[PDB]
Amino acid sequence: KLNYRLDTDPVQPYKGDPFNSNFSTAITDSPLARAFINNLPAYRKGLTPFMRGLEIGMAHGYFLVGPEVVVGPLRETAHGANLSGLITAIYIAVSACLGISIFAITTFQGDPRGAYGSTSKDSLRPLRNRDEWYQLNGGIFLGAMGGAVFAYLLLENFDALDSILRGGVNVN
Amino acid sequence: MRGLEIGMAHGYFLVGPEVVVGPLRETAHGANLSGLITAIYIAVSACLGISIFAITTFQGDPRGAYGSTSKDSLRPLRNRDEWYQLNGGIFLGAMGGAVFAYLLLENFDALDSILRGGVNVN
Amino acid sequence: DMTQLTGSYAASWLPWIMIPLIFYILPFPVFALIFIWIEKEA
Amino acid sequence: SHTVKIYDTCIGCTQCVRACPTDVLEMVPWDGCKAAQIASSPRTEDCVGCKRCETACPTDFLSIRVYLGAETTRSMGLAY
Amino acid sequence: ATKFPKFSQDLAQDPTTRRIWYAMATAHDFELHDGMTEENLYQKIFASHFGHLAIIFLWASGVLFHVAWQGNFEQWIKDPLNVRPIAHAIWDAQFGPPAIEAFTRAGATNPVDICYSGVYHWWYTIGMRTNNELYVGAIFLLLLAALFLFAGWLHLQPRYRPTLGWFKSAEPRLNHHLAGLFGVSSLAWAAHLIHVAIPESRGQHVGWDNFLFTPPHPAGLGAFFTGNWSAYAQNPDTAQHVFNSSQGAGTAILTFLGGFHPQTQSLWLTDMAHHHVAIAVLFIIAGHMYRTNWGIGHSIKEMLNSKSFFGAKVEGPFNLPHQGLYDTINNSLHFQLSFALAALGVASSLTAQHMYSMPPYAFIGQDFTTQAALYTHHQYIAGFLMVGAFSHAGIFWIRDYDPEQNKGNVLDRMLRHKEAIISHLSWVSLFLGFHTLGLYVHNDVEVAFGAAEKQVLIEPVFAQFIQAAHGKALYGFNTLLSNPDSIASTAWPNHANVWLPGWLDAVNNTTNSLFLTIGPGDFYVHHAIALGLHVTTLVLVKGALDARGSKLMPDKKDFGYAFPCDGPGRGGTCDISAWDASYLAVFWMLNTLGWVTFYWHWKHLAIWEGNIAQFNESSTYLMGWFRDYLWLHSAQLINGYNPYGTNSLAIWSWMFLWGHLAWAVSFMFLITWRGYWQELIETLVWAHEKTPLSFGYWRDKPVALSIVQARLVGLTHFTVGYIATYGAFLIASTAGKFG
Amino acid sequence: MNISDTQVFVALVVALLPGLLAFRLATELYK
Amino acid sequence: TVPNTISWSPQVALIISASSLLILLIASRSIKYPQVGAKLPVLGSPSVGTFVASMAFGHVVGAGIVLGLSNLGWL
Ligand code: F6C
Ligand code: F6C
Ligand code: CLA
Ligand code: CLA
Ligand code: CLA
Ligand SMILES: CC1=C(/C=C/C(C)=C/C=C/C(C)=C/C=C/C=C(C)/C=C/C=C(C)/C=C/C2=C(C)CCCC2(C)C)C(C)(C)CCC1
Ligand SMILES: CC1=C(/C=C/C(C)=C/C=C/C(C)=C/C=C/C=C(C)/C=C/C=C(C)/C=C/C2=C(C)CCCC2(C)C)C(C)(C)CCC1
Ligand SMILES: CC1=C(C/C=C(\C)CCC[C@H](C)CCC[C@H](C)CCCC(C)C)C(=O)c2ccccc2C1=O
Ligand SMILES: [Ca+2]
Ligand SMILES: [Ca+2]
């Protein structure tokens, strides 16, 4: 008389284990969600740790420039606003890279505690070696600095780039 | 390091064509910006191509010259990790060389005074 | 003035951003996606 | 690989075997014709599909038929 | 092996680049997919059809949205005859200031394209007035496309996947598609015309906010139920009516005036409303013919298998064996596709032939470039649809036809006298080609030698007689509708020719395209068209009927529809498959449609110029076509840009060249064949393998394109160049000399 | 008087629904 | 403006009687539990509860129809 009806359940246990504190939902287990998340540079199969950090840094440093350019305290002038946005991205990225460095220093002592231990099976945290974290951090810093400068250069040359994208450079 | 040197050289020389014969050549600032942007676009496209080459080539035993039994001496990067490190070096070196050329061209008046000794007037 | 691309229609910046995106920004990533799709080992 | 089929109208003239540039065919004992032999295709993996065997076949219609199928490295005749 | 393609292990194991190409060429050939069953085939086709409908709706929504966003619909309403409709804005960041100025026109302050699809006139006729209405229509079409996409997804879920019997039930599908899809849709369109379009054309706004309490006719629905239908035909629009205004506007919703509205020079809105009402009634009636669930109704299988004509023993309908055909069509998707494509091609041809002569949209007959574009578009689409109909006829012959279940029926008889059919088609083609070309070049020689009076100039007397019988009194004939005393014109028993006055007024009007005057040049070009039609039919029919085999290849059916050849033996067998026949027939279809559109365009150009004599005197010899049509009208097209500047035709000037480029490229794929390129590719492979610093290496071995792939690619380039070149020429030569 | 910024943005948002449904239908057909 | 309402006439009686009758045919053959309670031809022999329900709903639907039509000049 007891019918759990698990065989027709739209939401299944995660990876077939009902006692892993997770569900098989559209966010966690749908084919598009898995394809998108697992192919982000953090999880993409085969990527070297430095290459992971390079792509993550490029993306994050590029957009971190924006907020202070538009609503920052130097927004009244174009030249000042761009500089403040670039410095804000540099300060945040350097602070984050310092945090990543001291995370690697403290986590990887003997057998690491928690999710980075030898016996841990956390699929969402695959960087299990100290060397991988330092290679990732080097990529993060260089990518973030490059992406921030790339946004800074485009914004600094916005007058030229606006004419570029409208064909105003074709007058002469 | 291989990628770094190759990127340095290629990004450095890729800026010039659009600077000299590009559509923004009428003004120095726009020409330099267009050359730098062209170098960046070409290098990023090449790096994306290298990434997808590494992704598709190294599955199981790679086909062709990158297989385990291949003896191609002209293609010595037989590992996926080597290709990804090469790509990172290529991107960073190409961006650095393009920016170096852009900075040299943007300050061409100052650098021309430098190389003629005109900075020694005062 | 007729020295630049302009738009009197609403949100004339939309072509300004979308033409580059569709025609020479996103197409290479799309080609990369398709190339990865068509080269995957069984 | 391509598919090579030999039908019962074969007269055992051995011309298809002689014309094959990759040795797909051979002559095997048979009793359906006066020559007491018939063509066989044990090595269709090596068949490139040139259809020289069909050109060599004198019967009407052909006693040997080549049906082009899945293309492999050796079926496309690739040296690389 | 690779995962891609998912539907073919044979391709997935291919180690060359061919694997990719064929994967795109066989993706939609569901029947050849690995492990495909009939039920899965039908369900996948159903979902694909849902997707295609969604794509069509998205395309219509995009057209509407771009007109509402960047067009000039409201400005064009106030002066349809002098304002250029705007397709969409131009954003090309590599334009120069001269190009920006040249393309900034039609009242816009930014570069724009000029719409030539006629959607402005169509939306104007059906009562749309504001950009907000177009925007609402675009949003609604977006939602409709979303609905159809969801339906396609849903009918693939396990509970909602239809069974094979549901797909095979022909009679209910015919009933619903006749009565509902054709009939009810026509009734709803007539309702839209009566409730919305006609009041809007009479200066009265009817929308969703007020259509519920705004009756379309003063008599109301009471006149319909009491049998007083004539009240709907009382007080029509006066001949002095001004469109989109109440001046001279009547109250009738269903007239049968005939002819054209005097100002818009297009069909009366009330006439089209009554047309769609009658069509809806007829199709709803036709949708009750077959039996589904209540006993009453015909059974198509019984009709085809019947052998008794009221007791007398007949072999079938018209004493012809039609037995076993119900299973033949019902089990062959290619047979049904062949009928559908042929019907759509005939419908597109009729659309082209009937919209230019009887314009249905206000002022569209005075937009010359739009008229030419629409006619050429629908004629070329009709030609492609006919080619597809015969291609899938051949595919049916190979894949779905078996002689056992069709033993002795009419299809088997056609297959048995295919030789006579093909030989007589060849004779007709030879006669037409020989005599038409001979007369053309005889006129060429006579005109070249200063003896234009010595031309053979055969009058098209039969078509002139038909035009006179339709009411054209120009030729002096006094037969049927051109004779007011004829029993046809009077309709003696009933005198119910309420259409005849307006129809005759439209026919004898010299400013429209209703039964254009025709002379010897029209005779010769119609015979050229007949030659082209017969040769294209010969190619397609010979391919379809020989698809199962011939003397050269008796066992062709065992090789499939599309294969390169059967080798150089037995003399050589290049282009022997039925696919190759369709490939060859695409060339002849393009040539025939080129002749048709050349004729239409030159005649209408002469009419619009005011120089009908040029066409009348020059179309009888081919040098006239070469000089006065192509060379004479190419000047403005080729001067779109020159060393002295650029104008708005520059795009066409570029595209005109672009087509000539693509066409030229096709020759390379059509003249040079595979082995040459395979050897060249082998040399390039060696070069790549022996070059240092070239770390790249192919994952798929580079090979030359296959023989069939080469024919397809060459045909695609040929067709694309053909279409682009002729479209650029048409648009530049019509728009460059007119609005 | 053509449509406004708000109408264009609303159309862009609305077009997301057919886009997601088209992706769903394509992935279902790929099965 | 106030929506138009018409004086009593045989047409409004026809609409209410028809709406009650159509509901009676449908309800006696479509609802989950008819023939419950005390019993009252072509009908499915509805109970007193089902019949009163159909007449009450016939007044509800009928009043909505006549008010809606009179509002719009007969729709
Ligand atoms: C991948 C990689 C690779 C490499 C490396 O690694 C290479 C290299 C080589 C060398 C060795 C030489 C010299 C160079 C030149 O000058 O030319 C070219 C140019 C170019 C530009 C090429 C290109 C290069 C690369 C590709 C780059 C890339 C980059 C990009 C940008 C990417 C992008 C990506 C995205 C996504 C799109 C060559 C060549 C040849 N090719 Mg060859 N490649 C290849 C690729 C390819 C493909 C795909 C194909 C098809 C199309 C071909 C083709 C060809 C032909 C036809 C020929 C000839 O003729 C030549 C010769 O032999 O001489 C003698 N090939 N090449
Ligand atoms: C098209 C083509 C074309 C074009 C166009 O037309 C061009 C242009 C152009 C122009 C812009 C310039 C100059 C400018 C004048 O005059 O003024 C300034 C100067 C200066 C500033 C100079 C100063 C001095 C310096 C700094 C020194 C140098 C350093 C080094 C690099 C180191 C070395 C290390 C080791 C030993 C190697 C240039 C240059 C060039 N290049 Mg060209 N390019 C082309 C090509 C090429 C190719 C292929 C190749 C090879 C690779 C090339 C290389 C090179 C090199 C190395 C170079 C240098 O140095 C420079 C520069 O960038 O710079 C900054 N292109 N360029
Ligand atoms: C099939 C319909 C269709 C087509 C052919 C076009 C065509 C065009 N649009 Mg467009 N558009 C459409 C619908 C369409 N539109 C709809 C419904 C919207 C509202 C969301 C827009 C909103 C829009 C904007 C905001 C802009 C354009 C622009 C343009 C031009 C450049 C292309 C571009 O940037 O796309 C941009 C496309 C979008 C922002 C969304 C398009 C959404 C449609 C429905 C996708 C259709 C997919 C298609 C049916 C599937 C193809 C299948 C494949 C096998 C062919 C070009 C003329 C640009 C322009 O005017 O340049 C001058 C521009 O800036 N469009
Ligand atoms: C509703 C109409 C309709 C439908 C449902 C089909 C359906 C089918 N046809 Mg068919 N056909 C049609 C119209 C139609 N056709 C017309 C009008 C023609 C005449 C031109 C043909 C000519 C034709 C031939 C000659 C063959 C088929 C074949 C097929 C089958 C496999 C399709 C295939 O090869 O994969 C999908 C194929 C492609 C996607 C081809 C690539 C596109 C081509 C090269 C056009 C070039 C694209 C152009 C530049 C731009 C177009 C727009 C762009 C968005 C693509 C399939 C059952 C084949 C078959 O059954 O094999 C035995 C076959 O050999 N058909
Ligand atoms: C200008 C180009 C051209 C011409 C004139 C022809 C002519 C012909 N084609 Mg053709 N074709 C062409 C291009 C052309 N094709 C192309 C590009 C393709 C795509 C590959 C095809 C594909 C094709 C197919 C698939 C078929 C044809 C067929 C035909 C014939 C049918 C018409 C006919 O009998 O008229 C009468 C004949 C002619 C008009 C030919 C010219 C006759 C000359 C002028 C007589 C002169 C005699 C004189 C003494 C010669 C001087 C001496 C000289 C020998 C030195 C005809 C021979 C069909 C056929 O053979 O059916 C019978 C057929 O099935 N063609
Ligand atoms: C999820 C999703 C999404 C989202 C997305 C995103 C979020 C994006 C972002 C993006 C981004 C945010 C991006 C970025 C990028 C970046 C880049 C691309 C960069 C580059 C850079 C460079 C190239 C640099 C360079 C350099 C160096 C390195 C050094 C020297 C200097 C220079 C500058 C040269 C959406 C909603 C849409 C849809 C749905 C889904
Ligand atoms: C073979 C030979 C030759 C040739 C040569 C060549 C070809 C050369 C070239 C050269 C080149 C072409 C070079 C280049 C170089 C480069 C460099 C040297 C660069 C540098 C860079 C840098 C240093 C950068 C930096 C950076 C970064 C990294 C980041 C941040 C920013 C910056 C900018 C700072 C000849 C004929 C003469 C003779 C015979 C032999
Ligand atoms: C040029 C040519 C080649 C060589 C051409 C080859 C090998 C194809 C080269 C294509 C390159 C690599 C890419 C070109 C891509 C197109 C411009 C666009 C393709 C678009 C789809 C991928 C969507 C043949 O192999 C061949 C074979 C048989 C008869 C005639 C010919 C022939 O004429
Ligand atoms: Ca310039
Ligand atoms: Ca100094």
Q: What one-character-per-residue DSSP string does E542-564 give?
A: HHHHTTT--SS-TTGGGG-S---
> What is the biggest distance separating any 2 CA atoms in chain B, rounded to whole angstroms?
67
SS3 (DSSP) at D3: strand
* Alpha-carbon Rg for chain B in angstroms: 19
- Name the residue of chain A whose CA is nearest to E91's CA: A166
Q: Which residues pair with E290 in a beta bridge?
A: E298
- Enter the DSSP assignment of G3: P
* Chain E contact for C7 (CB, 8 A cutoff): yes
Residue E389 to residue E540: CA distance in whole angstroms: 9
Phi-psi region of E324 (alpha: psi -120 to 50; beta: other; left: phi over 0): left
Answer for the pair E287, E532: CB distance below 8 angstroms, yes or no.
no
Residue D46 to residue G69: CA distance in whole angstroms: 83
Nearest to E93 by CA among B56, B24, G63: B24
* DSSP H/E element including D39: strand D37-40
Show residues of chain A in contact with C15, CB under 8 Å.
none
How many angstroms does the Cα of residue A168 sit away from the middle of ligand 9?
8
Q: Which contacts qualify for E529-534: CB closer than 8 Å, 24 or more apart?
A: E529/E592, E529/E595, E529/E596, E529/E599, E530/E432, E531/E429, E531/E432, E531/E433, E531/E436, E532/E588, E532/E591, E532/E592, E532/E595, E532/E596, E533/E592, E534/E425, E534/E428, E534/E429, E534/E432
B106 in contact with ligand 2, CB cutoff 6 A: no
- In this structure, the dihedral spanned by the alpha carbons of residues B74, B78, B80 and B82, taken in order and rounded to 10 degrees, is -70
Show residues of chain E in contact with G73, CB under 8 Å.
213, 215
Residue E563 to residue E557: CA distance in whole angstroms: 11
- Choosing from B95, B99, B100, B102 the residue with most ligand 6 atoms within 8 A of its CB, the one to mutate for a pocket test is B95
Asked if the Cβ–Cβ distance from A160 to B80 is below 8 Å, we say no
Answer for the pair E152, E54: CB distance below 8 angstroms, yes or no.
yes
Neighbouring subunits of G (3+ Cβ pairs under 8 A): E
Resolution, Å (one decimal):
2.0
Return phi, psi of residue D3, to 5°.
-115, 125
Q: Which residues pair with E210 in a beta bridge?
A: none
* DSSP H/E element including B8: helix B2-13
- For residue B118, how many other CB atoms are within 10 A of its CB? 11
Give the nearest ligand 7 atom to B93 CA.
28
Rounded to 5°, the CA angle B85-B89-B91 comes to: 115
Partner residue opposite E699 with nearest CB, options B56, B72, B77: B56
- For residue E174, how many other CB atoms are within 10 A of its CB? 16
Residue E194 to residue E251: CA distance in whole angstroms: 11
Residue A171 to residue A168: CA distance in whole angstroms: 6
* Chain F contact for C11 (CB, 8 A cutoff): yes
Give the nearest ligand 3 atom to C7 CA.
62
Nearest to E163 by CA among E3, E23, E37: E37
Q: What is the 3-state secondary structure (H, E, C) of E443-464?
A: HHHHHHCCCHHHCCCCCCHHHH
Residues 6+ apart with CB under 8 A from B3: B85, B86, B87, B88, B89, B90, B91, B92, B93
Nearest to B51 by CA among B78, B80, B11, B9: B80
Answer for the pair E735, E369: CB distance below 8 angstroms, yes or no.
yes
* Chain F contact for E149 (CB, 8 A cutoff): yes
SS3 (DSSP) at D20: coil
Nearest to E316 by CA among E295, E301, E335, E298: E301
Chain C nearest-CA distance from B120, in A, is 44
Answer for the pair G22, G30: CB distance below 8 angstroms, yes or no.
no
Residues preceding gaps in chain D (C to N > 2.5 Å):
none
Answer for the pair E69, E86: CB distance below 8 angstroms, yes or no.
no
Residue type, B50: I
How far from each other are the two terminal CA atoms of chain E, in whole angstroms? Answer: 59
Return phi, psi of residue E290, to 5°.
-105, 155
Q: At what angle do helices B28-57 and B80-106 cross, to 10 degrees?
A: 180
User: What's the length of chain G?
Assistant: 75
SS3 (DSSP) at E481: helix
Q: Quick one: tokens of E173?
A: 């599908």
Q: At what angle do helices A49-64 and A78-107 cross, to 10 degrees?
A: 150
Chain A nearest-CA distance from F23, in A, is 10
Alpha-carbon D21 to chain mean position = 10
Residues 6+ apart with CB under 8 A from E623: E444, E447, E448
Rounded to 5°, the CA angle E86-E87-E92 comes to: 105
Asked if the Cβ–Cβ distance from C3 to A171 is below 8 Å, we say yes
Residue type, G15: I
- Residue B98, classified by CB atoms within 10 Å of its CB into exposed (0-12), middle (13-18) or buried (19+), is buried
Q: Quick one: tokens of B15?
A: 């800026």
- For residue B109, how many other CB atoms are within 10 A of its CB? 10
DSSP string, A101-140: HHHHHHH-SSS-SGGGSTT---TT----SHHHHHHHHHHH
Residues 6+ apart with CB under 8 A from E387: E536, E540, E582, E585, E586, E589
Q: Is the peptide bond prior to E615 cis by the omega test (within 30 degrees of 0)?
A: no
Q: Is the peptide bond prior to E5 cis by the omega test (within 30 degrees of 0)?
A: yes
Return phi, psi of residue E298, to 5°.
-75, 150
Residue E173 to residue E725: CA distance in whole angstroms: 42
How far from each other are the two terminal CA atoms of chain B, in whole angstroms? Answer: 42
Q: Is A73 annotated as a binding residue?
A: yes
Which residue in this structure is represented by tokens 């009402």?
A: E277
* Chain F contact for A2 (CB, 8 A cutoff): no
* DSSP H/E element including E139: helix E131-154
Answer for the pair E732, E652: CB distance below 8 angstroms, yes or no.
yes
Nearest to E372 by CA among E725, E655, E737, E727: E727
Residues 6+ apart with CB under 8 A from E648: E102, E103, E105, E640
Partner residue opposite C36 with nearest CB, options B45, B52, B60: B52
β-strands A12-13, A23-24 pairing:
antiparallel
- For residue B26, how many other CB atoms are within 10 A of its CB? 11
CA distances to A149, E50, G69 from E213, rounded to whole Å, are 65, 36, 9
* Chain A contact for F27 (CB, 8 A cutoff): yes
DSSP string, G11-33: HHHHHHHHHHHHHHHHHHHHSSS
Q: Quick one: tokens of E371?
A: 């008229």
Q: Do chains F and G touch (3 or more CB pairs under 8 A)?
A: no
Answer for the pair A139, A53: CB distance below 8 angstroms, yes or no.
yes
Ligand 8 site residues (CB inside 6 A) read E 668-669, 672-674, 677, 704-705, 710
Phi-psi region of E722 (alpha: psi -120 to 50; beta: other; left: phi over 0): alpha
* Alpha-carbon Rg for chain C in angstroms: 17
**Protein residue closest via CA to atom 10 of ligand 6:** A59
Residue E486 to residue E469: CA distance in whole angstroms: 10
- For residue E373, how many other CB atoms are within 10 A of its CB? 20
H-type alpha helices, chain A? 26-29, 31-38, 49-64, 66-71, 78-107, 130-156, 158-166
Asked if the Cβ–Cβ distance from E93 to A167 is below 8 Å, we say yes
- Enter the DSSP assignment of A57: H
Residue A139 to residue A102: CA distance in whole angstroms: 16
Residues 6+ apart with CB under 8 A from E338: E389, E390, E392, E393, E396
Rounded to 5°, the CA angle A43-A44-A49 comes to: 75
DSSP string, E642-667: ETTEE-TTHHHHHHHHHHHHHHHHHH
Answer for the pair E731, E589: CB distance below 8 angstroms, yes or no.
no
Nearest ligand atom owner, CA of B121 = 10
- Residue E87, classified by CB atoms within 10 Å of its CB into exposed (0-12), middle (13-18) or buried (19+), is buried
How many angstroms does the Cα of residue E531 sit away from the middle of ligand 5?
11
Q: Is A65 annotated as a binding residue?
A: no
- In this structure, the dihedral spanned by the alpha carbons of residues E193, E197, E199 and E204, taken in order and rounded to 10 degrees, is 160
Rounded to 5°, the CA angle E66-E72-E75 comes to: 155
Phi-psi region of E244 (alpha: psi -120 to 50; beta: other; left: phi over 0): left
Show residues of chain A in contact with B24, CB under 8 Å.
160, 164, 169
- Name the residue of chain E whose CA is nearest to A167's CA: E93
Chain E nearest-CA distance from C13, in A, is 10
> What is the biggest distance separating any 2 CA atoms in chain A, rounded to whole angstroms?
85
Chain A nearest-CA distance from B70, in A, is 21
Residue A124 to residue B62: CA distance in whole angstroms: 28
- In this structure, the dihedral spanned by the alpha carbons of residues E45, E50, E51 and E53, taken in order and rounded to 10 degrees, is 120
Asked if the Cβ–Cβ distance from E100 to A167 is below 8 Å, we say yes
β-strands D3-6, D64-67 pairing:
antiparallel
Chain E nearest-CA distance from F24, in A, is 7
Residue type, E111: P
CA distances to A101, E340, E582 from E337, rounded to whole Å, are 67, 5, 16
How many angstroms does the Cα of residue E66 sit away from the middle of ligand 3?
8
SS3 (DSSP) at D35: coil
- Name the residue of chain F whose CA is nearest to C9's CA: F2
- Name the residue of chain C whose CA is nearest to E96's CA: C3
Residues preceding gaps in chain C (C to N > 2.5 Å):
none
Nearest to D65 by CA among E546, E707, E564, E554: E554
Residue E508 to residue E467: CA distance in whole angstroms: 10
Residue E422 to residue E543: CA distance in whole angstroms: 10
* Alpha-carbon Rg for chain D in angstroms: 12
Residues 6+ apart with CB under 8 A from E47: E152, E153, E155, E156, F25, F28, F29
B58 in contact with ligand 7, CB cutoff 6 A: no
**Protein residue closest via CA to atom 12 of ligand 8:** E702
Asked if the Cβ–Cβ distance from A166 to E94 is below 8 Å, we say no
Neighbouring subunits of A (3+ Cβ pairs under 8 A): B, C, E, F
Q: Quick one: tokens of E211?
A: 């259509």
Q: Is A68 annotated as a binding residue?
A: no
DSSP string, chain C: --SS----STTTHHHHHHHHIIIIISHHHHHHHHHHHHH-B-
Which residue in this structure is represented by tokens 């105003």?
A: A168
Mutate to test the interface with F, among C8, C9, C40 (most CBs of F within 10 A): C9
Q: Is A132 annotated as a binding residue?
A: no
Q: What is the 3-state secondary structure (H, E, C) of E73-113?
A: HHHHHHCCCCCCCEEEECCCCCCCHHHHHHHCCCCCCCCEE
How far from each other are the two terminal CA atoms of chain D, in whole angstroms? Answer: 18
**Protein residue closest via CA to atom 15 of ligand 7:** B9
Q: Which contacts qualify for E329-336: CB closer than 8 Å, 24 or more apart?
A: E329/E170, E330/E168, E330/E170, E331/E168, E331/E400, E332/E396, E332/E399, E332/E400, E332/E401, E333/E31, E333/E41, E333/E45, E333/E400, E334/E392, E334/E393, E334/E395, E334/E396, E334/E399, E334/E400, E335/E392, E335/E393, E335/E396, E335/E400
- For residue E493, how many other CB atoms are within 10 A of its CB? 7
Show residues of chain B in contact with C41, CB under 8 Å.
59-60
Q: Which method resolved this structure?
A: cryo-EM
Phi-psi region of E572 (alpha: psi -120 to 50; beta: other; left: phi over 0): left
Mutate to test the interface with E, among C38, C39, C40, C41 (most CBs of E within 10 A): C38
Answer for the pair E481, E489: CB distance below 8 angstroms, yes or no.
yes
Q: Do chains F and B touch (3 or more CB pairs under 8 A)?
A: no
Q: Which residues of G30-65 are buried (b: 16+ CB within 10 A; e: fewer)?
A: eeeebeeeeeeeeeeebbeebbebbbebbeebbeeb
Nearest to A153 by CA among B106, G25, E477, E122: B106
Answer for the pair E435, E456: CB distance below 8 angstroms, yes or no.
no
- Name the residue of chain A whose CA is nearest to E97's CA: A171
- Residue D2, classified by CB atoms within 10 Å of its CB into exposed (0-12), middle (13-18) or buried (19+), is buried
Chain F nearest-CA distance from E148, in A, is 9
CA distances to E64, E135, E195, E201 from E205, rounded to whole Å, are 20, 17, 10, 9
Residues 6+ apart with CB under 8 A from E725: E655, E656, E659, E660, E663
Residue E87 to residue E651: CA distance in whole angstroms: 15
Answer for the pair E640, E646: CB distance below 8 angstroms, yes or no.
yes
**Protein residue closest via CA to atom 13 of ligand 4:** E388
Which residue in this structure is represented by tokens 């004198």?
A: D58
Which residue in this structure is represented by tokens 């690739």?
A: D78
Alpha-carbon A6 to chain mean position = 37
How far from each other are the two terminal CA atoms of chain F, in whole angstroms? Answer: 47
Answer for the pair E655, E689: CB distance below 8 angstroms, yes or no.
no
Residue E480 to residue E471: CA distance in whole angstroms: 7
Phi-psi region of A112 (alpha: psi -120 to 50; beta: other; left: phi over 0): beta
Answer for the pair B78, B66: CB distance below 8 angstroms, yes or no.
yes
How far from each other are the two terminal CA atoms of chain A, in whole angstroms? Answer: 85
